[PDB]
From a paper:
To understand how [name] acted on [name]-polyUb specifically, we determined the structure of OTULINcat [name] bound to [name]-diUb to 1.9 Å resolution. The distal and proximal Ub moieties occupy extensive S1 and S1’ Ub-binding sites on [name], respectively. The binding interface with the distal Ub covers 1,045 Å2 and involves the Ile44 patch that interacts with a helical arm (aa 254–264) conserved in all [name] domains. The proximal Ub binds with an interface of 880 Å2 to an S1’ Ub-binding site formed by helices α1 and α2 of OTULINcat via an unusual binding surface on Ub involving the Ub helix and the Phe4 patch. The extensive S1’ Ub-binding site is likely to be important for [name] specificity in that it orients the proximal Ub such that only [name] points toward the catalytic center. Importantly, [name] wedges these linkage points apart by two loops (aa 125–127 and 282–284) that fix Lys63 in a dedicated binding pocket. The complex structure revealed that the proximal Ub directly participates in the organization of the catalytic center. The carbonyl group of [name] sterically interferes with the inhibited conformation of His339, pushing it into an active conformation. More significantly, Glu16 of the proximal Ub is inserted into the catalytic center, displacing the inhibitory [name] residue Asp336, further restricting the mobility of His339. In addition, Glu16 coordinates the third residue in the catalytic triad Asn341, aligning it toward His339.
Here, we reveal a previously unannotated human DUB, [name] (also known as FAM105B), which is exquisitely specific for [name] linkages. FAM105B comprises 352 amino acids (aa), and the [name] domain spans the majority of the protein (aa 80–352) and an N-terminal region with predicted helical content. Having established FAM105B as a [name]-linkage-specific [name] DUB, we named the enzyme [name] ([name] DUB with linear linkage specificity). Crystal structures of the [name] catalytic domain in complex with diubiquitin reveal [name]-specific Ub-binding sites and a mechanism of substrate-assisted catalysis in which the proximal Ub activates the catalytic triad of the protease.
Residue numbers in the entry:
A (entry chain A): 78 to 174, 183 to 351
B (entry chain B): 1 to 146
């Protein structure tokens, strides 16, 4: 029974256990962790079940939750599944990890859980409650269905805007230039359905995740140590008002969570 | 002539190329400079995914043209490997990763030489040139080291 978000461990102790080889790559990983350790004290290992990008981002977003974001507060959000599925029947090709009711229940849960965290009186109580939330398997995976649906919705908006000659974030031009992702239908069948199952997110889909939940995602990419990509931000130039969450990716294949002293369980 | 290749980080790579160079050539240059395997690379220009066998001229790419690099590498997968000692190690991997790449990672993490490594999944010895997906090794599968 893998833990969703493992208990925090001292970051250099974690590094030491994980990278023991006498090789340039191990040395690079250790140097990367050293630099991360200047700003973060601990690491929580995130479960690598192909939901990791969503789990890590959402855990960080919700565990820091001081307000319910307006986009999540909006009543219209609850009308979205019926609005979209009625309009685009191909959305019924959604693979679950009826449809309108199931997605709606997921979005309702996301809103309710996030609001419950935001309404707590102390940051400590919020952190503890968020930890417990990510030990309820069923509820947790429902949250990721909500997030995947928000990614699909945002992709539809950007696609339709782009097709009308309207201004769009540039990543969306690249997202839909991919041969397996030329339209929202292909994005769903070839990329999103696989999320949490047989495949995770590409870098261009990290942008889409950031826009879906309106959080800026800062990633320490240890493999890019000593280059300008060592700290990579999704999206590159985000709205100033989006909260920032930080992840670590050793070599672009999985995302764990770095933790500040002021974020510690103890 | 000079062309630019921009990543989804706005990092810009400058390449010296010729009009008759192919997209395959360009990916090879990107591998040389960035260490990115050609099979992970997509190059996009004017909203089109460029094909390996066509030339820059074929795509009207000229001096100062900017291509965009959009990688296929996905994040979010772990597998487990049990060593000859009995220790369990956790690797961060991609379904397209080769067995050879996995053995190299075991060396980086544990110091075990790839030449000494025999990996088993579902009774099968795994061949170096094949990918995790070729063997239907999924997230949180366990491989055995002998």
């Amino acid at each position: 029974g893998p833990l969703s978000v493992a208990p925090e461990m001292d970051i250099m102790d974690y590094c030491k256990k994980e990278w023991r080889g006498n090789t340039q790559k191990a040395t690079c990983m250790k140097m990367g962790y050293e630099e991360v350790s200047q700003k973060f004290t601990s690491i929580r290992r995130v479960r690598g079940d192909n939901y990791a990008a969503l789990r890590a981002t959402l855990f960080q977003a919700m565990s820091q939750a001081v307000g319910l974001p307006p986009w999540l507060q909006d009543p219209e959000l609850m009308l979205l599944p019926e609005k979209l599925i009625s309009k685009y029947n191909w959305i019924k090709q959604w693979k679950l990890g009826d449809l309108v009711d199931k997605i709606k229940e997921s979005l309702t849960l996301l809103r309710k859980k996030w609001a419950g965290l935001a309404e707590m009186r102390t940051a400590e109580a919020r952190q503890i409650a968020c930890d417990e939330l990510f030990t309820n398997e069923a509820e947790e995976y429902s949250l990721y269905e909500a997030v995947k649906f928000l990614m699909l919705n945002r992709a539809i908006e950007l696609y339709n805007d782009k097709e009308k000659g309207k201004e769009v974030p540039f990543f969306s031009v690249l997202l839909f230039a991919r041969d397996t992702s030329n339209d929202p239908g292909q994005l769903l069948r070839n990329h999103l359905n696989q999320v949490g199952h047989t495949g995770g997110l590409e870098q261009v889909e990290m942008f889409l995740l950031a826009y879906a939940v309106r959080h800026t995602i800062q990633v320490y990419r240890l493999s890019k140590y000593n280059t300008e990509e060592f700290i990579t931000v999704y999206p590159t130039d985000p709205p100033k008002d989006w909260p920032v969450v930080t992840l670590i990716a050793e070599d672009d294949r999985h995302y764990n969570i770095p933790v500040r002293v002021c974020e510690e369980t103890s | 002539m000079q062309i630019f290749v921009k990543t989804l980080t706005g990092k810009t790579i400058t390449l010296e190329v010729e009009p008759s160079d192919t997209i395959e050539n360009v990916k090879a240059k990107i591998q040389d400079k960035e260490g990115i395997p050609p099979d992970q690379q997509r190059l996009i220009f004017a909203g089109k995914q460029l094909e390996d066998g066509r030339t820059l001229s074929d795509y009207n790419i000229q001096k100062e043209s900017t291509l965009h690099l959009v990688l296929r590498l996905r994040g979010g997968m772990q597998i487990f490997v049990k060593t000859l000692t009995g220790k369990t190690i956790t690797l961060e991997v991609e379904p397209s990763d080769t067995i050879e790449n996995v053995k190299a990672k075991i060396q980086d993490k544990e110091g075990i030489p790839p030449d000494q490594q025999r990996l088993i999944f579902a009774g099968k010895q795994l061949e170096d040139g094949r990918t995790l997906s070729d063997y239907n090794i999924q997230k949180e599968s366990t491989l055995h080291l002998v």
